[PDB]
Design a protein around this ligand. Sequence first.
Ligand SMILES: Nc1ncnc2c1ncn2[C@@H]1O[C@H](COP(=O)(O)OP(=O)(O)NP(=O)(O)O)[C@@H](O)[C@H]1O
Ligand SMILES: Nc1ncnc2c1ncn2[C@@H]1O[C@H](COP(=O)(O)OP(=O)(O)NP(=O)(O)O)[C@@H](O)[C@H]1O
Ligand SMILES: [Mg+2]
Ligand SMILES: [Mg+2]
Ligand SMILES: [Zn+2]
Ligand SMILES: [Zn+2]
Lengths: 414, 419, 10, 9
Amino acid sequence: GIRLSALCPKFLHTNSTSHTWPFSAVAELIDNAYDPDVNAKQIWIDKTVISDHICLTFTDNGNGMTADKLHKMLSFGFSDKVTMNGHVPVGLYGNGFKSGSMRLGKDAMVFTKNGETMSVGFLSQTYLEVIKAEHVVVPIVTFNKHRQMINLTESKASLAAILEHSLFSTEQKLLAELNAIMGKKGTRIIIWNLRSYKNATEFDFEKDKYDIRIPEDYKKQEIAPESDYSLRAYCSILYLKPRMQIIIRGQKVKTQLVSKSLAYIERDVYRPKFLTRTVRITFGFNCRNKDHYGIMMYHKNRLIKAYEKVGCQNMGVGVVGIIECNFLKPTHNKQDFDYTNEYRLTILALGEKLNDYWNEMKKRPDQTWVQCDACLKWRKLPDGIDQLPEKWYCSNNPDPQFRNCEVPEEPEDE
Amino acid sequence: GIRLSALCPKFLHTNSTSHTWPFSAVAELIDNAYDPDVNAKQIWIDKTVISDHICLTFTDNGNGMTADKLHKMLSFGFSDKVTMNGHVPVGLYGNGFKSGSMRLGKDAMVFTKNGETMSVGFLSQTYLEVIKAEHVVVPIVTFNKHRQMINLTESKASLAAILEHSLFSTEQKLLAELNAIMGKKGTRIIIWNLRSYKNATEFDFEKDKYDIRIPEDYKKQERQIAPESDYSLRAYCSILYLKPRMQIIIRGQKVKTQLVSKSLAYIERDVYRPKFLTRTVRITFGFNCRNKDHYGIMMYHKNRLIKAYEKVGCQLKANNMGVGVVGIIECNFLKPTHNKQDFDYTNEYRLTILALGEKLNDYWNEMKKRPDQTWVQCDACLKWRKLPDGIDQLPEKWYCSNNPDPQFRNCEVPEEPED
Amino acid sequence: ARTKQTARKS
Amino acid sequence: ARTKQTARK
Ligand SMILES: Nc1ncnc2c1ncn2[C@@H]1O[C@H](COP(=O)(O)OP(=O)(O)NP(=O)(O)O)[C@@H](O)[C@H]1O
Ligand SMILES: Nc1ncnc2c1ncn2[C@@H]1O[C@H](COP(=O)(O)OP(=O)(O)NP(=O)(O)O)[C@@H](O)[C@H]1O
Ligand SMILES: [Mg+2]
Ligand SMILES: [Mg+2]
Ligand SMILES: [Zn+2]
Ligand SMILES: [Zn+2]
């Protein structure tokens, strides 16, 4: 007879307030694709328009979800991720999709295929406001491999809601997105009702069509390094030892390598009292720029903090350190660690070591298109596609904006 | 037929990961007492031991809660607070108690009286682990003014749970805490299983008897010599509210609120008039006479302090500029972050920051005992028991067994030495 | 009821 | 199927 704690729709906004850098939210979605339970080898991040709404999409070729798993994804605190074959999940908290999605936009939808079933999940602030829901309710529709519904009572109600309040008015509209996952397995996340300032999106898509950017009005709370304002630059350094390929705006992201990025590389070790094991550090002088230097702190192969100054905050420059600390704990937005005693010690050690180091030491990739078999029109393709079907038609186009034979061909780049 | 989104117990820890500075969590509990729906005049923050567990307690003489409201309190996202008579609530998110309590400790209990009923609510990670709940369930027990149980099916179950896994193993143990709320109306929050490092709590209670402090290994992350507020709860509580409406008592000694007029010199006033607003924002600029070296901008939101000692303008630029210069501004137009220790980093925040620095620069170029403890004597045993500051009035006859303080509740317990 | 006072010592 | 290639930018 004991009551369950309840979730109010308003909390959805509240849970997003930790992200003050939007890329933190983006990073979270990427992480979920990266994690070994999904095991995606590609993630495509795109900007498109659907039903007159600017949309951000995250599409991956990973394992997908059962319906129940979908529910957990749309629920708070459920995570069951284990290391596989030395692939360690970043995911811990069980909050990352909600916090990220909602930070990016009011409304989000998840289409997933696990190769036995496909499901569609709705997490909308807008929907909840309209129906004046007192609880967070997440519609789910599920289908067999044959496009036949299952779990009908849930599905019927869910579909009715989704069709009515969703971007996608028709069943036909929904399955198109399911179709945009080319493989048997995978997931597509669509987010709309993006944060707008000055009646325009927080993001700037105009300046570089191959990037998602933060407008000039840019630096973090903290001359800004690129990763601060370019998603592409950020994605490059996001993973220390990349296991997945990220495509932004259809152009794949070229990962940096320490070699060819740094000179006078030297190794160092951290042997805290509190730790069983040693932790390596790599110190380098920064080739590309100068102004960008500091420590790169990675946790579980993912980047938490970058360009953090240590030791000498002038004096000591162009110096970079790379360390991975799996013993620290990330904060709510995974952009910092908990400010513990151990964290403090690590920072201290890093500075001393860096100081020692200092004293001691002194063409984008080609686009690809396919021709439609029933227009003869050429339609643009994103990188990272291993296989095309024998014949390709505008109808099966993943890009929402050229799914019609009657859609004029895009000019190639001037 | 659509499914409800679900809360997993593990989330309770997750929600607490915003707070990296323990005080931010404490602050949330204070705000909730401060807020006009509660309207507490006084809040008592204490360290005590119960059932062999160190505990932090937060007790107020505010309006209290109905059973349902208590449920919402133990629920995520429900807030319905409105300004009254110019008293503007701090809370809008609906997450602060959960985020705070859980940051401070694994388990928490809430006792409340609204003067028609009293109810008790349990929010424990430990309880949830032990019964392996897949969902967050919050047991609640509710009573009538006559100490009779009501809403029985829930209470009956709720109660059984509280006794078994709670600190308080008996109906009697529970009612004691309810008693510790002296007024007809009010609330008591008890938090236990506090965070421990080095097999000791993250907090240091022994260095100062009258304070809750963070031990030295202490500066905040942002900071580089540390002002008091960073390591002392009392120091922090002084500056917490711009125009205080409530009295905070820590460890039984009340907290005296700092005043600008008595704290700053060469006070000057400036105005912020940005294009995005229809109203002026006042600013106060002062020189810090007192510790030379805590200076910067204090930014207040809804009369509440969000960040302090933010360095702006020339102060940023070099070692030597702006030192001793303090600014006070309230920004109601900004939005606080998850832990309410910062604002959302938006074009508006950036602009405001820029203006403060320019304005601060202009200013800079332009210019150039503790209160007594009180004791009460037990009528039955004649022992003297220490009393916290802030009590408006006492009953005619007082006995060790009606003591709010948990540690001295029976006459059989030795009288405590005076200082 | 009866009440003393004392000095708190820093 | 048929696939062109192109320079970017
Ligand atoms: N792209 C995806 N593909 C497959 N499964 C996913 C995907 N995104 C989320 N999930 C599932 O839904 C859950 C939600 O992810 P998230 O909300 O990030 O929680 P988490 O990754 O487990 N922990 P954290 O990320 O640390 O908050 C994950 O546990 C996954 O099981
Ligand atoms: N000491 C208290 N006395 C009475 N009611 C309380 C008390 N603390 C919390 N509540 C109720 O419980 C709710 C939860 O508080 P909290 O979790 O802080 O949410 P909030 O203050 O409404 N919003 P925020 O604090 O901004 O997250 C409040 O809205 C109050 O209605
Ligand atoms: Mg995740
Ligand atoms: Mg609050
Ligand atoms: Zn075609
Ligand atoms: Zn006595």
